[PDB]
Amino acid sequence: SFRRFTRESLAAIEKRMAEKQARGSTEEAPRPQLDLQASKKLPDLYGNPPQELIGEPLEDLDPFYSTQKTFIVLNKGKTIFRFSATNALYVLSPFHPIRRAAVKILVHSLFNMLIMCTILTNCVFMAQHDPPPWTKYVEYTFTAIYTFESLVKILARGFCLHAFTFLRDPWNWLDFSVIIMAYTTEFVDLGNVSALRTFRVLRALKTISVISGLKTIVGALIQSVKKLADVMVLTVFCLSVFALIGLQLFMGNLRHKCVRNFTALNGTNGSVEADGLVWESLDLYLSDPENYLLKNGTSDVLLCGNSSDAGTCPEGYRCLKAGENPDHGYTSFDSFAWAFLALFRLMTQDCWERLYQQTLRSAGKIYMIFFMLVIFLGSFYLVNLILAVVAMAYEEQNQATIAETEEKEKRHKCPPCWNRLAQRYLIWECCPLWMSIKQGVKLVVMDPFTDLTITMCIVLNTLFMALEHYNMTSEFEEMLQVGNLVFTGIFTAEMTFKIIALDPYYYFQQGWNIFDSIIVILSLMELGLSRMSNLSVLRSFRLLRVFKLAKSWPTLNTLIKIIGNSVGALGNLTLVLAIIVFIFAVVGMQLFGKNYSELRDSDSGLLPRWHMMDFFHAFLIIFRILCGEWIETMWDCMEVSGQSLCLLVFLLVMVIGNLVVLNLFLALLLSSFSKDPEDCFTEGCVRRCPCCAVDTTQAPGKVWWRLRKTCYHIVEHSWFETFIIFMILLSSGALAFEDIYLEERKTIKVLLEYADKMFTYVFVLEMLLKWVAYGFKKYFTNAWCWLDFLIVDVSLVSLVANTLGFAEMGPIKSLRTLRALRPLRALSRFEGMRVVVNALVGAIPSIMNVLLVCLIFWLIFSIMGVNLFAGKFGRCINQTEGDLPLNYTIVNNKSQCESLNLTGELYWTKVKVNFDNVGAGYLALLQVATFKGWMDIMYAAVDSRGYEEQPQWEYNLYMYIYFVIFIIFGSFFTLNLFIGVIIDNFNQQKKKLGGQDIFMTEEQKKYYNAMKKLGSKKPQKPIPRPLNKYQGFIFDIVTKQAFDVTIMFLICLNMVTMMVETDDQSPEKINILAKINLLFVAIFTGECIVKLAALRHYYFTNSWNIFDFVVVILSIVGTVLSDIIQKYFFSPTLFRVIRLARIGRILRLIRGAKGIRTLLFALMMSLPALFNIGLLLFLVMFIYSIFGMANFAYVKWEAGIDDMFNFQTFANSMLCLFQITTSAGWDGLLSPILNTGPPYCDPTLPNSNGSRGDCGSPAVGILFFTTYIIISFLIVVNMYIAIILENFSVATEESTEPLSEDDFDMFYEIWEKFDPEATQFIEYSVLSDFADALSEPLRIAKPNQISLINMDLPMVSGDRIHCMDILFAFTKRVLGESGEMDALKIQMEEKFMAA
Ligand SMILES: *[C@@H]1O[C@H](CO)[C@@H](O[C@@H]2O[C@H](CO)[C@@H](O[C@@H]3O[C@H](CO)[C@@H](O[C@@H]4O[C@H](CO)[C@@H](O[C@@H]5O[C@H](CO)[C@@H](O)[C@H](O)[C@H]5NC(C)=O)[C@H](O)[C@H]4NC(C)=O)[C@H](O)[C@H]3NC(C)=O)[C@H](O)[C@H]2NC(C)=O)[C@H](O)[C@H]1NC(C)=O
Ligand SMILES: CC(C)CCC[C@@H](C)[C@H]1CC[C@H]2[C@@H]3CC=C4C[C@@H](OC(=O)CCC(=O)O)CC[C@]4(C)[C@H]3CC[C@]12C
Ligand SMILES: CC(C)CCC[C@@H](C)[C@H]1CC[C@H]2[C@@H]3CC=C4C[C@@H](OC(=O)CCC(=O)O)CC[C@]4(C)[C@H]3CC[C@]12C
Ligand SMILES: CC(C)CCC[C@@H](C)[C@H]1CC[C@H]2[C@@H]3CC=C4C[C@@H](OC(=O)CCC(=O)O)CC[C@]4(C)[C@H]3CC[C@]12C
Ligand SMILES: CC(C)CCC[C@@H](C)[C@H]1CC[C@H]2[C@@H]3CC=C4C[C@@H](OC(=O)CCC(=O)O)CC[C@]4(C)[C@H]3CC[C@]12C
Ligand SMILES: CC(C)CCC[C@@H](C)[C@H]1CC[C@H]2[C@@H]3CC=C4C[C@@H](OC(=O)CCC(=O)O)CC[C@]4(C)[C@H]3CC[C@]12C
Ligand SMILES: CC(C)CCC[C@@H](C)[C@H]1CC[C@H]2[C@@H]3CC=C4C[C@@H](OC(=O)CCC(=O)O)CC[C@]4(C)[C@H]3CC[C@]12C
Ligand SMILES: *[C@@H]1O[C@H](CO)[C@@H](O[C@@H]2O[C@H](CO)[C@@H](O)[C@H](O)[C@H]2NC(C)=O)[C@H](O)[C@H]1NC(C)=O
Ligand SMILES: *[C@@H]1O[C@H](CO)[C@@H](O)[C@H](O)[C@H]1NC(C)=O
Ligand SMILES: *[C@@H]1O[C@H](CO)[C@@H](O)[C@H](O)[C@H]1NC(C)=O
Ligand SMILES: *[C@@H]1O[C@H](CO)[C@@H](O)[C@H](O)[C@H]1NC(C)=O
């Protein structure tokens, strides 16, 4: 505390504190007195800096918990540092000046500034893949600087000698090997071993030991992942169950292919002859790839099958199983490990479509249902559980921080001082001159007028630059020339014209003036290069003007807030993410550098894309693996690198990166968040229409009354709704038979023609009855009738058109597509549908408020893309060589390859998706944001060259940055904003109603809370014992945990048994393993029998016992089936369907492991919140399929359209919609409907129906796909929200926590002390002394006897006090009216009263 210490004062205390073992002592719970934990300022008592007393050891003026032999020092920033004043043997004592010099070296900030200048330097020189040798010398220097950093600490803190040593801190040795390796090579000669010295990357983790904010956020992440549990166990268990299921369905099923016909051996020792070619052996014909058939349009082996729904190849080929697995042989169902990888592939949702088609072709259509299950249980439920647990773990930290902060709180900037000379020179800008115009301008700035017009100037100009298309043929080039000048001048006119009105002493107030000044300086500086027309990209920074439309917007400021939060408030975590990405990008190169040298050997040395021979491609590949695409680049491993390393690298990258990104996303969100009926109508204008209120005392008025009552009776009857439902369902189903059957069958044609007419007749009759039953109240008190009217009018129009032979015109024939709206009339006839639509219609403003912002933000980047990439995507190609581009020595520009068109084999093509207009830019950006189909777009962009020039390989490798920026800005923050607004409005909507009852019907609302509880009364124990020899010990056998040990042992051994399975194996193991199966079934059956009469016949309860009989029956009937039908086995499908019954008997272990029960419970409580959403999704999908079958019937089979995936029939349309409902690839489906060119479109087509051509109309297709994508996303988001919230609803925890059972014992003992009289009346005059013996008094003692009279102690009869009026009074003193034990006790006391 003071300047210096004496030699004896320290001894005076270090001798006294050492006497604890002898005299000091013959509860502490050490805590930082003022949250002192080093590396923190924490001014506690002084609050001011000393004169010169800082920087020296102190005696720690606090409790003697940190005095001992240690001391505390502070730097110029009052940073606490604790050191130990101990020796290091030999001639070394703390009373030396060298230790003081070391403290001065260490505490001061200067030291930090040195070390950083090294670390970042060392982060550059290891970024090269071929360094010159003289870099060894720089390495030398680096080593020295780290020797220093170590030596001062080693001398100051001690190696491991006494306490607070160098190695006591866990971080200090994390770089200890740094000092080893750099010396190890110096004295020890090195061998000829590679794959070594990639350890240097560990060095850059020292950056964390420097910026303390990084250490705090690292600790927070570690705590979150240590609080995340009881999810991975469910994930691996469910994945293993699904893998076991799939190993029994698609085994060996991915090698089916059809080969050119096998003829015979021709009756000799052996000769396989075919078209004059001879083969020696069968394996030389079955394993020869020259006989394989290739799927035209791609590069792979066609798959096939013998099934009735599998498909066939052209004639001359026979289907069979032979060869190797497809796609480099890394996808398989032959063994458990490959099935496990395939399912983890499905879990993450990447490159599924292809696997889906490959499995579907060989298995057949009927197996699609399997995938339908695997997605739903896989992608949604587990991911929701992970998100919920992470969210809770993060909320806890903020809550604890706020609580601790509240508890703790409850306990000049003039360095130069020259600018003031300007303050006494400025301000008075009026001068002797002015005194008129100055106030004139100040008045002329009119907020209700000028502030509006300037706003229009910002708007109109932003639209004027949207007309920047391709080949104006001028007129627009000079018109934009004039406009961008007039607009810039008007915009910058007020720049300095506002100074006279607003004194420059107040020139800068809020910073919006700073932003406007920066924009003006931008424009002026840009308009400084007129001598040239080149460098037009320079003129693109004017799109910054669009941010001026921020001050008049209620949600753009919101966005600017989120942005600011992420950059600065959350910088401490984004820097960590950047460091992690850099570390992984560097380590990948060192791990797999020298492996792609031999990957060329073609086309004069071109290299395949996405390599790791350079830093930029490493960053790109890490970005892709962080964006959720990893199979495509993983499959480039296992070929050069091997199987043992790429797997681990990719898997840990996936975990680390996804966890960090999700935590940052949640952090950013939480930061940003903080009797006569009515005749016509009311008594208004009806005073001039005595048209219904007429005399009814005679015949003329009875008609209206009787007709209205009869119609009312008709509509209320339930059988009328039954009739309506049946007709509506039949109407919806009738439309499913409009496929190519129309020109193939005849009676179904006449049937449907009659049916449509009768349907329209009945519907119009409904409408006529409706317009009378309820008067005119409808259409104005219930809007649902508007949809009915808008639908029925369509059919009436078509009927009147076709009746008179006037429906041969295109507008009328095209009106037949509006019949696809027929199923929508059933939306209002079911309760769950009404609930979900009424809940969904409550967020349209929420949708629009994000739609506007996203639209503007995306237009900003669309304009840039148009200005950069326009007019560079064309090329010319040879017909017979496919669509591949040519070289750059024969053709250079479009005119040249059009002039070389002498043979007619040269054709000009343009990329389907381009940047030639704003609209196409919108479509391209939508494709890039969704992550499907962007590869070809970036292939076009990277390969770009000058205007109208043939592309060259990788001429501009830096175009990736623009797409990277757009993905990071248009996907992360947009999702943030959308989630924020939708959740906020949805919760406010729930808050308005008063309860949590949303998405539930009237019965479900009550059943959800009626069928959910969590309480127990008294379970017991039965065990018959009229025979002490057998069952008395059977009871001991069952009650012990040895029964649990037996069950787990047996089921785990069966698990291990059923983990030996492969393809066709030697018969010896086939039979022995069947012996093992028989033994396991027998021992399980024996265990279920030995259960016997332990509970007699009273064990048939809800406990987990009847499932023993269930599994015994199922397993025995699935196992003895082989003996039942031993005669023949000709059912290579149904037998396998029975054999899955072994999947069971493995779900018996969910009975245990209590923690894997509540999560499952929440799901069964949550399914009814998903049924209605599934129904709505089904209806939407059916409507879209019906609409889609009508326009794409004859689209050419190109790209994703094949024989098994088209729109010719209902089934194929449903399959395609199922494929695209999750946006799992739609570019390949949209692609073959944009073709219009004669090369790609045959106008004349000899079809067999009322249609011509095989190419669709894009103007319908783009809308059809975009609307489905957006609707599917909205519904999936709603399902996500419901599932997450249901998992938070199950957090009751100590909702009751009675613990009241124990107490009744003292009351019963007092009763026994009071029982023999059996009067049940007590007097307080004796209870005053009686209650003093209460064990741990929960009631009144003797001094409190006077108060007991006033606390529920009634006097009845002759001033008598009842005992039954005291039990609940005592009970509520600890707990009451909350727990189930209290309610049971009070009800038992009431029953005793009734007794
Ligand atoms: C769709 O419908 C198709 C009907 O046209 C159907 O093809 C039929 O499939 C059956 C069963 O899959 C096949 O029956 C063949 O019958 C012959 C004569 O009995 C048998 O050939 C023997 O096969 C064994 C292998 O199981 C050979 O042993 C070893 O084979 C390997 C590889 O072939 C080779 O190294 C050697 O040949 C030998 N090993 C050694 C060390 O020597 C055995 O040699 C031959 N026999 C002879 C004389 O060579 C066998 O039962 C079977 N042949 C097979 C399976 O290759 C046959 O393909 C079709 N039926 C007929 C009557 O011709 C097709 O399978 C259906 N689609 C699907 C997906 O199932
Ligand atoms: C993550 C934040 C902290 C930025 C860190 C960036 C630097 C650590 C790295 C990243 C990219 C590196 C550059 C990538 C490429 C080169 C080219 C290189 O010279 C060559 O042209 C190499 C020969 C060849 O191109 O084949 C000189 C170093 C330099 C500028 C590198 C210097 C170090 C840089 C700037
Ligand atoms: C080959 C060698 C160099 C590998 C070295 C790696 C590990 C030994 C290091 C690297 C990061 C370290 C961790 C970084 C941060 C923390 C959080 C930190 O959290 C706390 O301080 C919590 C409160 C408490 O002290 O109990 C505890 C130590 C720990 C797990 C560290 C333990 C040691 C780790 C795992
Ligand atoms: C967690 C982040 C921050 C860093 C991850 C780094 C690892 C991916 C790297 C760093 C050092 C590498 C190791 C460096 C040296 C070797 C020795 C090498 O030994 C052998 O087996 C070669 C000889 C033989 O095959 O017999 C095997 C690879 C291995 C373990 C490497 C595996 C990959 C490691 C662990
Ligand atoms: C979003 C991108 C396109 C901006 C490109 C330029 C930026 C690198 C710079 C240029 C001018 C800078 C601005 C200049 C002046 C200010 C005022 C400054 O105000 C204050 O510090 C106090 C604010 C208050 O009084 O509350 C805040 C930062 C800000 C907006 C700066 C933010 C960063 C800007 C926009
Ligand atoms: C803006 C954010 C999203 C960038 C994130 C990645 C950066 C940390 C790294 C990755 C690749 C690096 C680049 C790799 C190679 C070059 C060499 C060299 O390039 C040029 O010749 C200039 C190109 C330019 O103007 O960007 C200058 C540094 C640069 C752009 C590097 C700068 C730093 C980059 C962009
Ligand atoms: C400034 C704000 C408003 C928008 C930021 C958008 C960036 C993502 C864009 C705008 C300017 C672009 C740069 C403009 C010019 C070039 C030079 C270009 O280099 C060449 O063309 C070299 C070949 C040659 O010309 O000989 C490489 C891309 C790069 C760095 C571009 C990379 C992407 C940038 C940074
Ligand atoms: C475009 O493709 C055709 C067809 O492959 C190429 O024509 C080749 O050469 C003559 C014509 O000069 C044909 O008779 C041959 O059949 C073709 N193949 C071979 C191997 O000669 C033609 O050269 C290609 N390029 C151009 C510019 O037409
Ligand atoms: C068939 O040919 C093989 C080898 O060519 C020969 O070993 C075998 O004996 C022949 N079988 C006969 C001749 O029956
Ligand atoms: C391409 O393959 C399909 C297979 O369904 C076939 O129908 C078609 O004829 C093939 N194309 C040509 C040009 O033969
Ligand atoms: C090719 O083999 C199949 C197999 O059934 C057969 O039906 C067909 O006739 C064979 N083709 C010829 C040309 O013999």
UniProtKB/Swiss-Prot annotation:
Changing A1211T: In BRGDA1; uncertain significance. It comes from Homo sapiens (Human). The chain crosses the membrane at residues 108-127, 136-157, 167-187, 195-214, 228-250, 365-391, 451-468, 478-500, 507-527, 538-552, 570-591, 644-672, 717-738, 750-772, 782-804, 811-830, 844-868, 959-983, 1042-1060, 1072-1093, 1103-1125, 1133-1153, 1164-1192, 1259-1284. CDD domains: Na_channel_gate. Channel inactivation is regulated by intracellular calcium levels. It is a tetrodotoxin-resistant voltage-gated Na(+) channel (Nav). It is a multi-pass membrane protein. Changing V964D: In BRGDA1; uncertain significance. This is Sodium channel protein type 5 subunit alpha. Changing S846Y: In LQT3 and SIDS. The gene is SCN5A.
